[PDB]
Amino acid sequence: GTREFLTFEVPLNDSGSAGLGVSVKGNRSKENHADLGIFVKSIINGGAASKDGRLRVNDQLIAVNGESLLGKANQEAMETLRRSMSTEGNKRGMIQLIVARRIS
């Protein structure tokens, strides 16, 4: 029942071709239709997400490039992500992505 926020700087300087080199998936409460957020579904060992070496196929996304995915549902955060990986998170050669990790 413990969580921890984490910040990751992913340099898509040359990974934008694929979209940072990672795939995310969003879900909702198992009791109702309450979107919980998005979690790293997979990673592409070739771009920023790979070279980052700080990503985890399960971490919960809460923010990206200053934006807050929390308040955003699965679809909204997924769009902000696609938006960041499309032409916002980059525009420099990297994008910020905050997440949450459980503890035990």
* Pairwise CA distance, residues 47 & 100, whole Å: 22
Which residue matches tokens 């995310």?
A: 24
Residue 16's Cα: distance from chain center in Å?
14
Radius of gyration of the chain (CA): 13
DSSP string, 4-16: EEEEEEE--TTTT
Q: Per the structure, how many domains does the chain have?
A: 1
**Experimental determination approach used:** NMR
CB atoms under 10 Å from CB of 51, counted, come to 16
Which residue matches tokens 């934008």?
A: 16
Query: What's the burial of 18, exposed, middle or buried (CB within 10 Å: 0-12/13-18/19+)?
Result: middle
Tell me which amino acid residue 77 is. Answer: A
* Pairwise CA distance, residues 48 & 53, whole Å: 9
Cα dihedral 82, 86, 87, 93, rounded to 10, equals 100
Tokens of 34: 């309450």
Tell me which amino acid residue 59 is. Answer: D
CATH number at residue 67: 2.30.42.10
* Pairwise CA distance, residues 37 & 53, whole Å: 22
What is the domain extent for residue 75?
1-104
* Pairwise CA distance, residues 97 & 63, whole Å: 6
